[PDB]
Design a protein around this nucleic acid. Sequence first.
RNA 1: GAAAAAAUUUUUUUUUAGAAUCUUUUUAUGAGUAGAAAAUCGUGGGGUUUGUGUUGAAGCGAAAUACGUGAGUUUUCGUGGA
RNA 2: UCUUAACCCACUCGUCUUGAAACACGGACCAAGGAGUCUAGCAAAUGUGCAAGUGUAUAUGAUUCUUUAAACAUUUUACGCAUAAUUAAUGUAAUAUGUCCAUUGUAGAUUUGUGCCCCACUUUGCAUACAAUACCGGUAAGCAAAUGCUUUAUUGAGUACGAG
RNA 3: UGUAGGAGACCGAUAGCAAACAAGUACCGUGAGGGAAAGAUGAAAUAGUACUCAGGAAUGAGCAAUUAAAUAGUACCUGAAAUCGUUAAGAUGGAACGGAUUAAGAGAGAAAACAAGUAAAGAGGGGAAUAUUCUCUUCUUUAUUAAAAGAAACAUCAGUGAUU
Lengths: 49, 121, 49, 49, 104, 53, 125, 147, 186
Amino acid sequence: PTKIWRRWGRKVNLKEKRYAVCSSIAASGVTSLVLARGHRISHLKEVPL
Amino acid sequence: KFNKQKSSSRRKMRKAHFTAPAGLRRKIMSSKLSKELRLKYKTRSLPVRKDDEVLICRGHNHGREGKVVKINRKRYKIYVERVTREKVNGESTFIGIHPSNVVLTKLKVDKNRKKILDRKA
Amino acid sequence: CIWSESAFKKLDVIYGKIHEKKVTKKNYILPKSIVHNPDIYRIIHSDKV
Amino acid sequence: PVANVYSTNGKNVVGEVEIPVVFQTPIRNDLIQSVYTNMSKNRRHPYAV
Amino acid sequence: SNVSNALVWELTRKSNCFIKKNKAGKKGVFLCDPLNVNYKNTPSSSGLVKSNSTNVTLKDGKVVFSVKVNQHFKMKNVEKLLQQHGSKNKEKLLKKYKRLSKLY
Amino acid sequence: VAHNNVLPNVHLHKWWQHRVRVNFSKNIKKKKRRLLREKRRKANGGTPIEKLH
Amino acid sequence: AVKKVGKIIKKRTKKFTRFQSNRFMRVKPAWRKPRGIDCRVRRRYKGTNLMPSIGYGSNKKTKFLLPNNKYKYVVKNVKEMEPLIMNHTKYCVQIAHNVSSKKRKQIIERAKQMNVSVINAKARL
Amino acid sequence: ATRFKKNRKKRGHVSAGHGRVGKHRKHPGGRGKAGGLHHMRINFDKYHPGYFGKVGMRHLNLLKNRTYCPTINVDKLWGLLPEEKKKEFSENKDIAPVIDVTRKGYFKVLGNGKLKHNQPIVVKARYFSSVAEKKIKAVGGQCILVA
Amino acid sequence: GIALKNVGRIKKHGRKHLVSKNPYLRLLVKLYNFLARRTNANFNKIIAKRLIMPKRYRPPLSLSKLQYHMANHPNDIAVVVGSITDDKRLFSLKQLKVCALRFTETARKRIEDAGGECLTFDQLALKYPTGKKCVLLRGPTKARTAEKHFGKAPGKPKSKARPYVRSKGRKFEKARGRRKSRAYKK
RNA sequence: GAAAAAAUUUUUUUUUAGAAUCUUUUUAUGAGUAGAAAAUCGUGGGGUUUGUGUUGAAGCGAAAUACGUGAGUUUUCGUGGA
RNA sequence: UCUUAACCCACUCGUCUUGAAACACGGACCAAGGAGUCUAGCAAAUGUGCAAGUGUAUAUGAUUCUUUAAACAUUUUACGCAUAAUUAAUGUAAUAUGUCCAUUGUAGAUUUGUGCCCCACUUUGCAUACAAUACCGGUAAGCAAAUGCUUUAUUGAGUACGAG
RNA sequence: UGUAGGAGACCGAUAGCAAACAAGUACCGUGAGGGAAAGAUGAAAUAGUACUCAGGAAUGAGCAAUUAAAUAGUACCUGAAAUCGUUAAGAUGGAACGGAUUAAGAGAGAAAACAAGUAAAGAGGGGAAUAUUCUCUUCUUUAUUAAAAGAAACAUCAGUGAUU
């Protein structure tokens, strides 16, 4: 049977989480990555908008 | 959407639709009001009544205006004057129309409706 | 991403250029990169190499 | 390292702001992906028999 | 700094929303970014990877010349524009435009 | 028991399935405690509700 | 035996058959490797359900190529045909099974203009 | 998680990847730590040497607070100052740092390593080694016993 | 037929390419593999091989140890295929020039303050092509605590392997079979 | 970075590669239960992406000059009505 | 493609078994269902972040309150494991101030030079392997009034600029 | 647990509460108790099978008839397999299929498995130039030249053989 007590969640680590946020924001900064992510961003003036 | 009081879960809503009591059923048999009337009353939509005159605008009878015969709250069907149809045994009955498929023109005021129309105003 | 100018200015404050008492995340720094510059082809192109 | 700020209508460009130092962090796709999978996992409601 | 062409390619040689990969016909992989000259999955051709570049596409029933920040224009006119703004490839691109031009 | 690995020692031997409890309640319980205490402070005429120690 | 045609050698034909599917209905026809303590087929007995193995494989410079001499590409929308203009001599379109007749016609027409072969050409008319 | 598991790699194979001949039977030696001293004695001798029997004095309630006492070696002592302060002491001979070992949460000072020769230092702590006193004295510093 | 060891298929051991999915590290292995393939210098190959190594094998290195190594030629550049960690035992540092994979935050601050130079591998390649005037170093490798449970088995004569225990007090694995008094000694 | 062929020196036709777990090439080699591994492939749901649907979806029956060593994948006609 | 032919070949699969085509067992047929999982604690492997620290616990705080039962935040020694060991134990506890130097060997990676590149000398001497010394806890033995002493034995899951 | 809310990376009618249905029901047990099976027409039956003919009756048929659809007809969605019917084709001397290779039948097919362009003149579609000039095209037709492609046959080499 499936019990109520599967290991549902995970304790993700503070320093890693912060880094992931910083890096994700930084990635958004780069034009090629946003375009690659598939946005129809062709006529936008600048990617850090 | 935002309130957590009213459930938005599909099953539960569907059950509510089918198991609805008669007063609630009377409420959700409401019809879009015609433009002249909408202008007159400042009102989008009304619960239908027997002696009113509807115009059909969805389904296979979309040219037809006419007076309402009977409304059936059990079956969710209104019936109209000349949307007659013969059955297999050569007997004439009325084609069921669902309220969304009719736009209501001339409506007959009475004191209960007059109260509603004032309440809307 | 669409940023307000106020948001944009506040972002820099958050990660500690001109830090603050409660806005800035305390004791935290931007993770330094493993590679300083990733232009591998420029390094290969470069005269000494 | 300056980025342009825009007006409400795009037919103007207003005052230039310095690019926040956050955007210079290493991109680190694997971190973002791995952190996202763990983080997302914590959202779930449980199920049993 | 923190980002350059090799890094971009490592980031986008796999994850990439304009990669389209042919499951039925095992040979095919295309990369369909609007600045790909040829539709290869290669940092030779990738519109994401390439620093500044020239491509003819087709958008909403009109052929478009685009150049990479980012311009748009509407055979001789195309030839002149390429000769101007551009920087083997030009010759290939002109040939591509003729072939493309036939469509309606 | 097999080779180098430390000796086993798990005390789940007396019946334990009938004795788990899994707290999915953390954030909601925290929110509830906060809301009651805040409500109490609001009720109490703008006074502090904390006592000196 | 070997099935040569021009530049295309394929070594084997007759699609490999799951052992015993001849003589019991439940046994599915598509392949399965026999395990078995001792069973003929795993043990490679003479003249019985010869096991497939990798060395049979088509040549690596002609691996997937249709008798069309062009690689098959499945298409369900005219936008997806935007790459294949540059490979019209070496890839051939197949229009996806799901695609409705109005759209399908449009895809056939675009392909013809673009000078690319269309294999399931007469479909749904 | 599940998709990577070993059993899926072996999925149709009769033993489930667990031996045709002997097969995997339930509880195959007897439970847990049972076979010690007898049929699994060789494992117990070879992997947990000292395990059986009792040794030494009994202690009825340990009450672990009484005997708590973290250590630090003298080696790390200057490191409890920040850099800039240390440099300033190196420059100026006339003053020396006191270091209260209690504030950083250590109780006994031990003698590993070499102190900087001819910087005196005053060390405040609950406990010292013999060696530590000699070393601290050797560089011209003093030890102060303090609760 | 024929008879050959492993039927004529040669068996190399260890890594074959990096496991790491990290883009920067992927970029670095590409770069050093290229330097390795083109040049004949042994420096490039060893840097490439060491760069591929798993997490346990490349250790953290202390500053103090690095100073001891650089002492007899302090003109030149230490390269260390690992992370460099800081030390509170080290009183002071005489302006070293160090390439490392990763710097602990405090160490970088100290080295910079001392007037030293912190190089990333890309920078090292760019400045120095063949490892000219460089010194490859790596830290204590076997000294990892895990390895003390390896080797000739614990409780087999003289061998110094750590056992595994719940806790290291007097009632746990310290009586029968570890002394003269109670059966055989260690 | 141009190779060839076709026309009637000048026009047309074909191709024109740089994906690093990848491309070119070379040579050796290929048994397998118990066992171990890697690489694939498929089913239910999820996030993400870009699509097919009433000029007929899924399903199903029969197939197919179809592709794959193979699990399979793809498609034709028929049924089907979401 | 299918269909019969024809030459030649070809024993019921699963299975336990030294040895099954068996006068061994299970299988009339078909369809759907149907079997190495989950938790706890431990380990190594490998990945990832930080690094003498590390984890932010419980919990608090937020114009955080569809999603959100998640995310976010945490005024200049709480706790776990690590950072030091050892002895039954009162307990004791790492070269040693001649020096910010960092015990000795033999091989040994990397480097410098000579007579852009193979050599052979030299030069530095990592990792690691093998030893050697010191020193710390226990025990001997010798001495003994003392902050116990000793050039000597031993013993430890010890130490000799950390690694978690 | 009782009752009321709200939920879901949960199950989808052999599952999931035993129980989506008139379920603690039918049914079984002296009794304590044991304890099921069984959801789906269609948009609308206020469209649920009128009428004629043959039938004692069931039913059947129709030139008749509801429906978009009755081979959706109340066993009502889709409708696999096992199994069995009809016709056609083949086979047929004490097993049947099978494998490896061809054959003779029987079906299928043109996407590589011939012919670009050019002209004549119909039918379409576009793109540009500054509503009409230029130019690109797809389908049809007439006729009119390419060319390539595979298979043959012989010949020349080269490689590997056999022969006198």
